[model samples]
Target: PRKYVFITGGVVSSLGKGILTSSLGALLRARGYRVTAIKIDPYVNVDAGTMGEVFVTADGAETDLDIGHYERFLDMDLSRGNNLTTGQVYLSVIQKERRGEYLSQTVQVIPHITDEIKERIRKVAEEQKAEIVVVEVGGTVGDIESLPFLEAIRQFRFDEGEGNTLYLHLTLVPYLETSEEFKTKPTQHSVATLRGVGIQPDILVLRSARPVPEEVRRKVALFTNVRPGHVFSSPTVHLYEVPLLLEEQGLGRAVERALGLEAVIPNLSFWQEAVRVLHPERTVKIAIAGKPDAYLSLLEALRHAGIKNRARVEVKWVDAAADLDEAFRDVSGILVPGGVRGIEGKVRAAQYARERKIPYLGICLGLQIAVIEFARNVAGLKGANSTEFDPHTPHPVIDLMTMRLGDWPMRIKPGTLLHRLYGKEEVLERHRHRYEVNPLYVDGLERAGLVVSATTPGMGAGLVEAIELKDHPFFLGLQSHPEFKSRPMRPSPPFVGFVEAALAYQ
Candidate 1:
């Protein structure tokens, strides 16, 4: 049977509840437990994909920061079911009512919306088989929007029986500058709020910017009625160290003890590997030409590359909305990471780097942009552009050609990297873009000396996936977000290869 841990925040916003949840999950996984993390967003939207840059601006991606945390901690994939919001819950209930599945009964939040929330919580355990489901309910305790979710988890814990669920509450302990004293009132209030809703935390991970002194822990424990040892006095330091610290504080053992499971946490292999790779001997600067705010997919990819090489790396963000020529000259390597609209200049940056013999990595639009740059500047075409930018362009090198998701495999060259990486002549990935590269422009780009290294398999609907520059040191581009699958301990080949090339260039 799966155990549940609900990590809720208190005091104020941005207190790193997501980070605590992720770190706990990591610690659990290190113990050899099958772990999955879920986020109850408590907002209203069908999903983040269609929400665009505002979502990115607000949360740094179409998804929440917790998703990034899970990626960092578990190094495993999370599906859409991982995220839930008030908007999504109401939308589902409304849809059911419209379908007449409600049987004309008066729809109420209780036994209806809250029931759905409870069902999702159980599904995370039973269906997903998550040995431990670390559910982070977004927003602070006592928010009206988060009330339903809080109740749902409370109900779930009750149904799960004693010891089946663990509530871990993360709250802030403010430091008074003048007195140099840490206040525990916020935590007390946060605990009180949780208690008001019939849910109480088994562990309290106190988030403070400085060292959480033993006195703070004692005071918090005394005030909240929790054991001082169980009041996790979180240390402020490294991102990777959080899991180990929590584990040291008896967090994993605590959960296992509560759930009656054998203590099985092993040493952190990934953390050790990251240290070995990042051996203090050398450092390299890598400049990426992409939108920093809207490129989680590429960020994931870059992180994979960074952890693999063990080299100290710095990413200087070169905004594609601004100047192109300046961004290309000072970098050891340049990657035009995946993005859409308002980033036309990154293509020019890639072209400039290719001309300068700088190591270049590109994905999706990056590949199309590289090819388009070659077609226009090198192949004698005056106006080569992506269909997303100029649909009416005479030489539209990049265009979207397919309607069905599965139809994507129907178009591609027989022997290429796309086909080879997939281990099949026909395959499909979790696609999210609606743009493609025009086949008509392929001949011109190839003629201009750009190697079309890969294309989509099965169909020839102008899906350009990968490209290489002839006689250039490590000039490569990809259409898919390889970073999405990369892990800290086990770096994806492309990222490892890209970082290696950057080191070589440096």
Candidate 2:
């Protein structure tokens, strides 16, 4: 049997509910429990797959951003069932109704749509064999879009019983500068609104810039009908330290008591050691050419690598449409993270990295761009480009892929950097790309000093998986996404190797 923790937010949006949920899950996991998380997004786009920048898992699930945090923090691989969207819920219901599974009864939202939500929650919890399953309901409280999800979880609480469910509510606690005091009225009102929907939170997580005063906590506790001990003050700081903060405020103990769980002491020494190692003074600055959100996995990968190496990492953002030469200056390393559009700027940046001998790490679209650059400048192909960019370029070094998705194996060439990183001849990785380096130009690219360091024969007549420049200290590009599988404790090899090279360059 598994216990459920339902997390909902109110008072405002972007209150760091995902961070809170992840932190709580981490704390519980520290206590020697198997933990898994589920994200219930209120969107109707069928799935996150349609969102261009979202990384697709090996199981073909395009999940919300919070799934990234869950995997990174828990060091667990999640499947498609971990994410449930409004569109997915409706689609399942409609498909069942169309197939006559309803059996002459008119389909309704309560037992039909809500039942689907409940079923998905239970199935994932059982599949993971999780001792504790943390489920986060997306969007703010009182939003019309999230009402169904909220109701589903509400019904779940009754079905699971009091000792099996815990309701955690995260809300904003604003600090009024003029009065120089933290306000509790917003949280009280937020809790009241939740009560209006027939759901009562067992705990209130107050998000603020500063500490919540004792009187404010008492006031919130009195009005919200929660124990003073269950009202936690979540002040802002390093996101990685959130678990420690929650533990310090007795959140772990409160949760155990609320769910009637046995007393299991949590060990946070690993996180403590990780936090101590991240110092701003000992830092390496790396410029990334893409939107901030698009490269979030890359940033987290760098952070994980820094933790492993005891070095601080600073990521500087470079607009994909801006001048590449100006942006590349003053950075220890340059990264052209995964993307399809903005080919021109990425190609220029790749050329700069190649010419300057600066450390460069390219992923997905970045790999194609680097290949095009090497083909044009080094291979002496005048107008080499990817079919994705021009479709009619005279020399199409990068062409469309025949295989589009899923996890695949890549055989690494011996005596290569990638082979050295993995210490193996073959490695499997997740991919979400539609184009690959054309095999016809492989010999020309190799002659120009580019090595196809890794490949997968099954992808279609041997598709290139990774490439490297022999002369540069660290100029590597990978066609698959290694960042998605990176974890804080065990950082991915590519990221650690990249950071090591960047440190060597520094």
Candidate 3:
């Protein structure tokens, strides 16, 4: 029914446009409308995939942390179309050229790159069958790299009709100690800059550490043409309370009113119930011990999942490196989140949990550890090592080149946690790391009483993912990172199972 919101940031970079967009989308969904989220990144990369640690935010979504937030808020799985970049646009053009579709004509950016972008947007919008499309444009307002995309948005708005679109400009409101006042010069100039390009923001979301004072809000309202109350404050809420908080401040309702959508109730009390359960007497601490990110943005993958479940679920971020003893103290559950290397205290932590049976959830590396530990100590494999750890080891427990040479194609095991949750065999999860558990170690671990739960299909005994000590309450591991698919309403099967184990201890 023509519901669209164009969200952009101003003044500085790394603002919370992605999280805000997702939060707004979440609010809309709670009101019972289908929503789709898209990121209009300005970088010249085909996707964030080949970017390789160039940038990241709170969550480790490969595209951008904002895409991470979109998944968290909507509690839905997003596909490839969810992310777009300048590089990706060019990549598509080059591919078309390689196929001789251009027929030897020298190609240029205008019709090719921009047209590719428009087609991508139109296809993605239709594919999702969305009642609402929340678009978060990357880079700041007035940014040179962002102009073409902004102009494209202007075109889309006109083509889609005024009834189909709404723009919400997000900007910072800084407090200056020297002037002893909150400033609006940046906001005013930013709005003027946007208007100069024929783009008008229907609402202004002021990003502030504190609530925006009425006087300052009035100034933005007066000059920026934003309604005084439409100037919503962006405060740090528990990410789970994000939608509720935005609804409290009227961001969702305002967007809907601007687009003239049918009003619906935002069912936030479900989250309220979850928060109530999380806060009962004692805090349930889950320690995510793994390799530190280039910017620790990958941790957002876990935080986004947890927040979607409950605002009050406290997550204690622990660096698995050099701090195993200190990191696991007083923790209710332990998660070894996905990472290639730099597994600081993974072995030590796994040893402690295996000996003590502290409900542990392991993603890729953790599964490797479970196998390696069982092989060398429990089974009689003399020098069992993962290729990830020692490439030259003769009996590498976690070996590579199982099914295919470079990378193994993944298929679900018939009866596993993932299969039970999703009910499918041929499914794909995000893959980033290079190594896997050596099939040689599987026999050793199984002999040592470590359960070899699931292996990838068509790959001869190469362990894809796993679990542990049948008698113990809850100790699980997987070859893939389940955190990649987690959302607010639907917890990842591994995460929920781990949390359910924690509930027993609670």
Candidate 4:
């Protein structure tokens, strides 16, 4: 049977409720439980892609960055059903009504919207077969946008039974530097606000900028009515340290008792080792010629690699509208991030990385740009471009092909950089794009020293998945998003190798 744990933020938003939920998930998974998390975004937008900070899931859903935490912590693949938004829920209900499925029943938030919300949650629980499904309500406690979700999950505890559900409330316990004390009054009111909505927190995890002391924890428990054992602190530690901190407070055992399960020891040695590398002996700036927040997962993946290499990966966000050359000067490496936008500027940026022999790593669109740059500069082809950019270009190197939208296996070439890094023939990664390197240009590009390091699984009409320059220090491009697979402790190999190449360049 599956159980649900709901997390709601209080005192304020942006309290890292997603991280807390993810840490709990990791703690449970280490104890050998099948786990998954669903993020309930109260926004009217159907998905997070337009709001930017989107990480593509294995099932091709462009979702909130929180899904990245969920996937990395649990080491699990989530599908489109895992993320629910207010716009999507409402649209589904409206469409159902238009199809006459409601059959003249007056639709309302209580039964109609609430039922859809509950249905979607159950859908993921069933799809993932989760023993503990962690659900995070998107907004702060009093927001009107979150009422339906709050009410729905409130009903969820009853529908599923109290033994099968657990509620966690995260609140800020602001520490006063001048007064030399941590304020517990805010947390008390936050709990009162949550209780105003009919959901009492079983566990109160306080968010403080500094470490919360024992008396602070006791005061919070006494006022908030949660047991002292149930009161935990989620302070400003390395994001990965949250699980270990919660584990120290017996969070896993608390969950076991609350859910009526047997106790089992959870091993977090892997994560413990990872947290040690969170600090850096030195730092290197990696220039990204795109908005930094737009590549949230990429930036995180870079940090994981930087941690692996003992370097602080600082990002220099260079808008292509700004000067790329100036930003590329002090950087050890530069990445031409996304594609289908900033074509001209990014193409020029790729040329700079190529001409200077600076370490260059290309993502999906980045790969396409690198190919176009080489085709124009090295292959003696003028105006070399993807058809998406200039359909009439005489040398169309990247153009219409399969719109690969989900996870696919890549057949790594035996003796290439990708092969050496992955140490295997096949590796799987998530992808979301509509264009591929023109099949006709493969042999010509290969002759010009662009090594086709990886390809799609099948031999016939094999689409390029990775490429590298034979002579450059680190000129590699990946059509798949290795960013989505990296965790704090276990960085992606391509990125880890790129960090090495970057350090070498430094």
Q: What lDDT would each prediction earn against the true structure?
A: 0.71, 0.85, 0.68, 0.85
Tens digits of per-residue lDDT for model 2, 298-338: 78889988777778988888766436667777688888887
Scanning candidate 3 in windows of ten residues, the lowest lDDT window is 52-61
lDDT of 4 by residue, 57-160 (tens): 87778888889889888888887788899999999999999999999999899899999999999998898888889999888888899999999999978898
Who wins the TM-score comparison? 2
lDDT of 3 by residue, 247-282 (tens): 877776787777877677678886666555444443
Backbone clash count for every predicted candidate, in the order shown: 13, 0, 13, 0
Superposed model 4: Cα runs more than 4 Å off? 176-181, 279-285, 307-331, 339-345, 387-392, 401-403, 457-462, 488-490, 504-506
Candidate 1 deviant stretches above 4 angstroms: 52-62, 291-293, 320-330, 340-344, 402-430, 458-462
TM per candidate: 0.89, 0.96, 0.85, 0.89
> 100, model 3: CA deviation in Å?
5.9
Candidate 4, position 91, lDDT: 98
Off by over 4 Å in 3: 52-62, 94-111, 227-229, 275-278, 291-327, 341-344, 402-430, 458-463, 503-506
User: How far does residue 250 in candidate 2 sit from its true spot (Å)?
Assistant: 0.6
TM-score of 2: 0.96
